């Protein structure tokens, strides 16, 4: 092998310039795409807001115009995804992991307008779903599109440009260039074989994407949480016990997202009219909850600072979590286009703040701030359920900037991805691609 190895070493990391010039172009498009997806979602949340203004007297009429604005927008997305591109239901990350194994197709001519306008529907009606599943799927399709347009040849150029698109897509969805590159390395590469994904091209894609996001979104950040305190060493064991809770509940929650996918199907039996009519009531419920208690609806990024700053009671934190456990399944297991990623960040943050409050009472000698356990729990489900803790850690890090908590954050992280493995749980994005390949030979 030594002859082999000595020859390969001397010729390491020489990505064809062609692939690199084409990587910059992928992220520029996935960025603008991702920028424009988000401007859309806001705009329609505003209409629901401003059209609640004109009807702010008849409290029953008010409850109903939010139902209808959301229910009508909800349906447009269930339909646009059933009629024209079925693989663009749900998040779409399984579908791009599928594609990289050469086990699923990339129908860009079809999925980009389905996902894009389908997502503006479900997201803008205020459904418990995030921009990430949409922007990551959109982004690979975008990187597939350029491949074809330039007829670039090879498995490398196909696997690279499809990746640098799905990374530069999660990057522009959370302003997270590292957590962009880490997803491709940790979760969305061919997980059982070596592949010719050029990291140096994924990188150039994430830069260009992020630079696009900063051109339309700078000076402001998605989660602002302050600078919380530090974590004494005689305190780290509380962050192990937290991860142990996430470690057991992570898989339980995986059974439910998998289970209830199957039980919402029993409703409509696969029928575009029983189905679009169902998701209009789901989507119309999220639009009603978003007013009578908005913390049980939406993506959830609003309640994270309210939560971390200790502004909730223990009661409201128990309600918000259970209520959000429910509305999270209903939106994602219905197949409505949109990620579960962000609606989990809110889940862990809520759980952390709860554990935080409990510690503060049992240990005044530890001088605790519950907010620190919120920051520890924030990426803890993204570790116990999608099982990608390195991407989850570096993501919450890039978004909350409390690097002094990197040690409790790493300890709760492992404490979940470990106790999940020891309670028989599965990488959810691969328990889906699993099931979605099971019917593809049945």
């Amino acid at each position, epitope marked *: 092998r030594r002859r082999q190895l000595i020859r390969q070493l001397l010729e390491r990391d020489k990505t064809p310039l062609a692939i690199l010039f084409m990587a910059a172009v992928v992220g520029t498009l996935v960025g603008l795409a991702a920028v424009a997806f988000d401007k859309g979602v806001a705009w329609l949340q505003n209409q629901r807001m401003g059209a609640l203004v004109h009807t702010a007297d008849n409290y029953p009429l008010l409850l109903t115009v939010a139902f209808l604005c959301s229910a009508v927008l909800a349906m447009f997305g269930y339909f646009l995804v059933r009629k024209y591109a079925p693989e663009a239901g749900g998040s779409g990350i399984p579908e791009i992991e599928g594609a990289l194994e050469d086990q699923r197709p990339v129908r860009w001519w079809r999925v980009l307008p389905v996902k894009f306008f389908g997502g503006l529907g479900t997201l803008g009606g205020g459904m418990v779903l995030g921009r990430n599943g949409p922007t990551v799927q959109i982004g690979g399709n975008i990187g597939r599109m350029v491949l074809d347009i330039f007829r670039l040849k090879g498995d490398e150029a196909r696997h690279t440009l499809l990746a640098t698109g799905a990374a530069a897509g999660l990057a522009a969805a959370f302003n997270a260039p590292l957590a962009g590159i880490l997803f491709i390395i940790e979760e969305m590469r061919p997980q059982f074989r070596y592949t010719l994904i050029s990291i140096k091209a994924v990188f150039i894609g994430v830069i260009m994407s992020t630079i696009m996001y900063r051109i339309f979104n700078h000076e402001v950040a998605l989660i602002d949480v302050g600078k919380l305190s530090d974590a*004494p060493l005689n305190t780290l064991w509380l962050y192990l016990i937290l991860g142990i809770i996430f470690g057991i509940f992570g898989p339980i929650f995986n059974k439910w997202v998998l289970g209830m996918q199957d039980l919402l199907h029993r409703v409509h039996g696969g029928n575009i009219t029983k189905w679009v009519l169902m998701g209009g009531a789901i989507g119309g419920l999220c639009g009603l909850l978003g007013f009578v208690a908005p913390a049980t609806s939406g993506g959830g990024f609003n309640l994270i600072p309210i939560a971390t700053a200790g502004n909730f009671s223990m009661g409201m934190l128990v309600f918000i979590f259970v209520a959000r456990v429910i509305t999270t399944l209903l939106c994602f297991s219905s197949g409505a286009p949109g990620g579960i990623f962000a609606p989990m960040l809110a889940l862990g943050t809520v759980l952390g703040t709860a554990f935080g409050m409990v510690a503060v009472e049992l240990f005044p*000698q530890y001088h605790l701030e519950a907010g620190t356990f919120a920051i520890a729990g924030m990426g803890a489900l993204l570790a116990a359920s999608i099982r990608a803790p390195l991407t989850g850690i570096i993501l919450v890090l890039e978004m909350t900037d409390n690097y002094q908590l990197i040690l409790p954050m790493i300890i709760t992280g492992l404490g979940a991805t470990l106790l999940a493995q020891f309670t028989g749980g599965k990488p959810l994005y691969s328990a889906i691609l699993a099931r979605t390949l099971a019917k593809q030979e049945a």
Partner: antibody, heavy 120, light 107 residues
Framework: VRLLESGGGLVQPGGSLKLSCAASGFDYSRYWMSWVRQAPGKGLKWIGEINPVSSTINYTPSLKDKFIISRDNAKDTLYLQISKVRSEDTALYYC??????????????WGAGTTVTVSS | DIVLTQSPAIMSAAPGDKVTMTCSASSSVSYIHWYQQKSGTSPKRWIYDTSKLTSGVPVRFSGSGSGTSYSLTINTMEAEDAATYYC?????????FGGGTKLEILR
């Protein structure tokens, strides 16, 4: 890095007074402050503590509002208000900045003291 | 409340001796701290986490102990070390101080 407490002096029995601790030299936010007292000749006795965002405040086994610990980060100042004052509060009042090693917390930098005399 | 008790209230010693004082607790405490308070002065953080010396404390000082027995030890005491020394725990809220060991010099 200094701690400079003031407002001691004379109080009427049963009365009240507001001690004050001016801080300079260190980010006064991101720091718990505390109050320890020392009766003349006797040893130390912890009065209370208070976290940076004023959201956490603890005291020694005292009554209703015997002690009340405020802080004003806008002025890097700590406060203490004793009420229904009796001779046990005739002491020297210390203002301590708190911090930790392994996490078992200690009184890091002490102030110079201010003296409360409860007398008629 | 953890009551802490320091073993000699008042000791005398002659520079060059090896002074040792001892802090004892009603219940178990861990990683306790020591304070030095010379005459007419504010207490000074002297030893923390049982055996770690605050910056600038001369190496002649040392801490040790565990459970309910803790001691501070000056190895060849010097004349400047004359003060009352206080111990304090905060492994149990509320934290509590010892009562002091006044070190006196013989000359």
């Amino acid at each position: 890095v200094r701690l400079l407490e003031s407002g001691g002096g004379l109080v009427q029995p049963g009365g009240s007074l507001k001690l004050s601790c001016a801080a300079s030299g260190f980010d006064y936010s991101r720091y718990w402050m505390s109050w320890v007292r020392q009766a003349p000749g006797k040893g130390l006795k912890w009065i209370g503590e208070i976290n940076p965002v004023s959201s956490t405040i603890n005291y020694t086994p005292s009554l209703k509002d015997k002690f009340i610990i405020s802080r004003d980060n806008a002025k890097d100042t700590l406060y203490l208000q004793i009420s229904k004052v009796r001779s046990e509060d005739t002491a020297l009042y210390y203002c301590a900045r708190l911090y930790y090693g392994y996490g078992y917390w200690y009184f890091d930098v002490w102030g110079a003291g201010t003296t409360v005399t409860v007398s008629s | 409340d953890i009551v802490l008790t320091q073993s000699p209230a008042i000791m005398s010693a002659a520079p060059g001796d090896k002074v040792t004082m001892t802090c004892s607790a009603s219940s178990s405490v861990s990683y306790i701290h020591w304070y030095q308070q010379k005459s007419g002065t504010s207490p000074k953080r002297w030893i923390y986490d049982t055996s770690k010396l605050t910056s600038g404390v001369p190496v002649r000082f040392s801490g040790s102990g565990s459970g309910t027995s803790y001691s501070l030890t000056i190895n060849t005491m010097e004349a400047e070390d004359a003060a009352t020394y206080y111990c304090q725990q905060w492994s149990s809220h509320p934290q509590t101080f010892g009562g002091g060991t006044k070190l006196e010099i013989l000359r």
